[PDB]
Amino acid sequence: VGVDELDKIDLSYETTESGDTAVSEDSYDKYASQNTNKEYVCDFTDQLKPTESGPKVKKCEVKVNEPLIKVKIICPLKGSVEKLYDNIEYVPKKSPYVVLTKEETKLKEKLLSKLIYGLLISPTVNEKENNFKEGVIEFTLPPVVHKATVFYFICDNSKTEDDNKKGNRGIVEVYVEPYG
Amino acid sequence: ALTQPRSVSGSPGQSVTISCTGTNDDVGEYNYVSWYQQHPGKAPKLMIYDVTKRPSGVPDRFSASKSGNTASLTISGLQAEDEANYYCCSYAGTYHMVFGGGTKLTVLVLGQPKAAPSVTLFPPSSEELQANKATLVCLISDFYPGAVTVAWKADSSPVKAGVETTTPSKQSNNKYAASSYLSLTPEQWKSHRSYSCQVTHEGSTVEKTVAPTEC
Amino acid sequence: EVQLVESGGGLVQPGRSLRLSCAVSGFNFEDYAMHWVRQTPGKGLEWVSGISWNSGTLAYGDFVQGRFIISRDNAKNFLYLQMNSLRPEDTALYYCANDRMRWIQVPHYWGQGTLVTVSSASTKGPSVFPLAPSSKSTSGGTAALGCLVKDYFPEPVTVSWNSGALTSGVHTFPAVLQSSGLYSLSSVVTVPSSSLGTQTYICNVNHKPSNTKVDKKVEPKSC
Ligand SMILES: [Cl-]
Ligand SMILES: [Cl-]
The missing domain is CATH 2.60.40.10 (Immunoglobulins)
Structure with a gap:
């Protein structure tokens, strides 16, 4: 693919961790990624379904300090099930090539490959493109990492409403501690 | 960035449809399509939200829909008060909005006369030439209906430089009332022997010719 | 509300x-x-x-x-x-x-x-020139006369034909941007030929962004 496509980045917006919800950081549901072999997984399909106590913030924390770790994030697709994800949005649109980083109090887009130097991003994942449009993104972290880096993905279902239930906002925080 | 037709028209009781085509990242992706009415000199007014819904007070002769990347606004049985500009609008993802380019809706009277423009061509005044300027002013009025053009000529050769023209507008007797201007230097106005404001409506060219004269 | x-x-x-x-x-x-x-x-x-x-x-x-x-x-x-x-x-x-x-x-x-x-253009009040009616039988029984509001900056300008009295036939046209970066517009009135030697037609032009008011009486072409 052309470099115009792979470096497609959107700097014309900013967000916070809570976004448009009124959920403070004290009230987040924080939990760790699932450790399956050397693959760390944030699966949002169950976590973001409309609940009566919605919107919640579901924050999946990926802490990396081992080499060659695969990170996989699943964001449930609009219309994958009826009603449950009808208004879901994901940010950045060009994840995993584009990630959010914390500039001051705001999250803004940055190229992940510019952020971590030996980064491995496959263009496809099980023959579907590596993009939340197909519901799964994946990347592999380098053999060594000099400087600690933190970045974010958003999978936000809080605009989805099903009767008395509202979907949840999902956050992935990836924290790469220095290793190697 | 959403694409709209430039203009639609109808007589009262007729129906008009205004299309609005976007991409699969805005109109095709979300059910967040809205439509606005704007009268000359006024702020926009929300007429449709969430593709099909009317705010309280919008008459139900306004309806709208979407199919793939194209939204549509239909005014069934349009009234004189509906003459306005209409703008589609859509969520564009990542907290952005995007507007269509706008469509002018003209409300006609079905079957009225076809062509009667009264073209008046003013040479540059003496006071203007004394101020080292020169403007020919071509005024077209009392005509219904047309979106036709205005060309200019110097002697036997066409003029394609210095021309500005204002789009027409209704009046009390439902007529044309439009303007055009040719900016020159005093040397250009005294050099050629005639200028012409030629217009064309219905394949019929109507030309007014004006020469420099000293008295 | x-x-x-x-x-x-x-x-x-x-x-x-x-x-x-x-x-x-x-x-x-x-x-x-x-x-x-x-x-x-x-x-x-x-x-x-x-x-x-x-x-x-x-x-x-x-x-x-x-x-x-x-x-x-x-x-x-x-x-x-x-x-x-x-x-x-x-x-x-x-x-x-x-x-x-x-x-x-x-x-x-x-x-x-x-x-x-x-714009790099600075504020400037208009020069008002007459669009003087010629008695050469332009349609015979009608006579358009107007005034040209030339080279003003910036927008807007309010044109009042004789202190808010002359209303019918009066189309204060919208402004055009010239290649110089300044604006110009015309304000015409359509009046019959026998109305020319009798009445008085004055265009007021009020350009607030330059604090300028201009009154100008348009009179027929003569020599
Ligand atoms: Cl309906
Ligand atoms: Cl826009």
Whole structure:
């Protein structure tokens, strides 16, 4: 693919961790990624379904300090099930090539490959493109990492409403501690 | 960035449809399509939200829909008060909005006369030439209906430089009332022997010719 | 009940900066997303920026390119737009609008707009020249006479044909931008030929951005 496509980045917006919800950081549901072999997984399909106590913030924390770790994030697709994800949005649109980083109090887009130097991003994942449009993104972290880096993905279902239930906002925080 | 037709028209009781085509990242992706009415000199007014819904007070002769990347606004049985500009609008993802380019809706009277423009061509005044300027002013009025053009000529050769023209507008007797201007230097106005404001409506060219004269 | 009042527009040179403000009332501002939208008076609507109720998200149109800052004061009920490094093509009327939702989705109620002109031309009152009626039987029984409002800057200008008296036949035409960067417009009246030697036709031209008023009596061509 052309470099115009792979470096497609959107700097014309900013967000916070809570976004448009009124959920403070004290009230987040924080939990760790699932450790399956050397693959760390944030699966949002169950976590973001409309609940009566919605919107919640579901924050999946990926802490990396081992080499060659695969990170996989699943964001449930609009219309994958009826009603449950009808208004879901994901940010950045060009994840995993584009990630959010914390500039001051705001999250803004940055190229992940510019952020971590030996980064491995496959263009496809099980023959579907590596993009939340197909519901799964994946990347592999380098053999060594000099400087600690933190970045974010958003999978936000809080605009989805099903009767008395509202979907949840999902956050992935990836924290790469220095290793190697 | 959403694409709209430039203009639609109808007589009262007729129906008009205004299309609005976007991409699969805005109109095709979300059910967040809205439509606005704007009268000359006024702020926009929300007429449709969430593709099909009317705010309280919008008459139900306004309806709208979407199919793939194209939204549509239909005014069934349009009234004189509906003459306005209409703008589609859509969520564009990542907290952005995007507007269509706008469509002018003209409300006609079905079957009225076809062509009667009264073209008046003013040479540059003496006071203007004394101020080292020169403007020919071509005024077209009392005509219904047309979106036709205005060309200019110097002697036997066409003029394609210095021309500005204002789009027409209704009046009390439902007529044309439009303007055009040719900016020159005093040397250009005294050099050629005639200028012409030629217009064309219905394949019929109507030309007014004006020469420099000293008295 | 609902109203929104924009302020802070005017004339700047290219590269300079303006701050737009929007004061609101009649709705609980703090619970609503808000928008800035511009309209070039010859062109259509163009989305400039938006901000959610809690400033948790904000965004900008693609022409903005890092130059503008949207923000909000939910206690004073104010919406702001800082506009840096302004370009001539940023010249437009600028509206603020609330949303139906607490997040950015659909502009609902709109203000009146504030005019922003960006140009290296400085402010100048018009020169008013007569468009003098010629008695050479232009259609025989009719006679258009007007006045040419030439080379003024910036917009707007208000034309009043004889102190708000001459109303019918009077079309104060919209302004055109000339290649010099200044504006010009015409104001014509259509009056019969026997009305020429009797009446008195004076066009008043009021250009507030240069503090100029011009009265000019148009009279037929003679020698
Ligand atoms: Cl309906
Ligand atoms: Cl737009």
